[PDB]
Amino acid sequence: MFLRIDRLQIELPMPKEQDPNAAAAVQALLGGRFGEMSTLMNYMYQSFNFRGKKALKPYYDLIANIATEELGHIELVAATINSLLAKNPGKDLEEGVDPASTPLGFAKDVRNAAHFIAGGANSLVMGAMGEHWNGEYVFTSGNLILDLLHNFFLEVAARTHKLRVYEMTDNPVAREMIGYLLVRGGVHAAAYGKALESLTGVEMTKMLPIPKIDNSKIPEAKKYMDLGFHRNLYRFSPEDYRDLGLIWKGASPEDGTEVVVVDGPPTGGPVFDAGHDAAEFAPEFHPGELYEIAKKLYEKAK
């Protein structure tokens, strides 16, 4: 079972301008083959399907726990896309929009028109070409070593996509998210590499980084390394998965320093609200009446 905390994993900056094509590129990191939906669903299904949940417990704890972290990463990437698509971020009401004035005219010419037609200027479950995420992006073979080898690869392929998208947009909201997730993905790659070394004797972490560029060269990633976050494997569970430190120990690939398990999630930051976009009818064309209904739900004695 799962619980939810109404917080993003980190604070994101306020966007300052809508940037559709940046949002379309960032979609690769959400619903593309190596996006966060893929790391999430790979680890989630491997955790469901895991044989030897007690006999191979440290490895089960690892996959079950990292799957849980990736839930917050789909959330964070979706918030980033929503930030880039928001017309009036954080504002409950805009007035004066007339459909006949062609208020979505710009959207005719952007790469991803679906953001504005199917979505209400919001994230979709798709990649940078509009391709919807598909369950064949999941590998769940039942063989622990084969799955871990796949997962090591998956994290460094995902990192490669994050780096390339970083190089496509200088939007600060996108770069903040990417910097943080480069650091988290470095932790995951390192953790799967340590798990493989424990099972096989092959020193997989010595292959890192892939590609051969250090996170310290990406300013927004270095920001988070400077706070120590490359050392931390957070245990996203009240009472379970307590044996992570049997694998998550020893040296960090980033700097050689000792890594640690942190019990519980990080503090986080607030969730994002894109505000009213009347041309998208989101959350309604003129939402004042609905806001009044919600207000009155609280005004009650019962």
Least Å distance, CB 51 to a copy of itself, is 4
Residue 19 in contact with Li ion, rule: CB under 5 A: yes
Q: How far is CA 63 from CA 72, 101, 142, 251, in A?
A: 15, 52, 13, 20
Q: Three-state SS for 277? A: strand
Q: Is 102:195 a contact under the CB 8 Å cutoff?
A: no
Is residue 131 involved in binding a copy of itself (CB under 8 A)?
yes
Show the site string, 183-202: x = touches a copy of itself by CB under 8 A, - = not: -------------x-xxxxx
The item of Li ion, Mn ion, a copy of itself, none sharing an interface with residue 95, based on CB under 5 to 8 Å by kind, is: none
Query: In the complex with a copy of itself, which residue's Cβ is closer, 227 or 293?
Result: 293
Cα separation of the two ends of the chain: 32
Q: In one letter, which amino acid is 257?
A: T
185 touching Mn ion, by CB under 5 A: yes
Q: Using CB under 5 A as the criterion, what x/- string covers residues 107-146 for binding Cl ion?
A: ----------------------------------------
Q: Is 69 labeled as ligand-binding?
A: no
Identify what 115 binds: Cl ion, Mn ion, Li ion, none; CB under 5 to 8 Å per kind.
none
Cis peptide leading into residue 283 (ω within 30°): yes
289 assigned binding-site residue: no
Residues 6+ apart with CB under 8 A from 242: 61, 235
Residue 218: half-sphere exposure toward Cβ, Cα within 13 Å: 30
Residues 241-260 that bind a copy of itself (CB under 8 A): 241, 243, 245-247, 249
Contact pick of 12, 63, 84, 124 for a copy of itself (by CB under 8 A): 124
Taking contact as CB under 5 A, which single stretch among the options 12-20, 205-213, 264-272, 273-281 is the one that binds Li ion? Answer: 12-20
Which amino acid does the sequence have at 85?
Answer: L
Contact predicate 35/133, CB 8 Å: yes
Question: Is 133 strand, coil or helix?
Answer: coil
231 near Mn ion (CB under 5 A): no
Among 9, 39, 65, 237, binds Cl ion (CB under 5 A): 39
- The residue written with tokens 């893929």 in the block is 38
| Residue 136 engages a copy of itself in binding (rule: CB under 8 A) | yes
Task: Name which position in 161, 162, 188, 222 contacts Mn ion (CB under 5 A).
Answer: 188
Asked whether position 216 contacts a copy of itself by CB under 8 A, the answer is: no
Nearest to 161 by CA among 42, 29, 41, 37: 29
Tokens 């004035």 sit on residue:
101
257 binds, among Mn ion, a copy of itself, Cl ion, none (CB under 5 to 8 A by kind): none
Report how many residues bind a copy of itself under the rule CB under 8 A. 162
103 in Cβ contact with 35 (< 8 Å): no
Q: Point out which residues bind Li ion (CB under 5 A).
A: 19
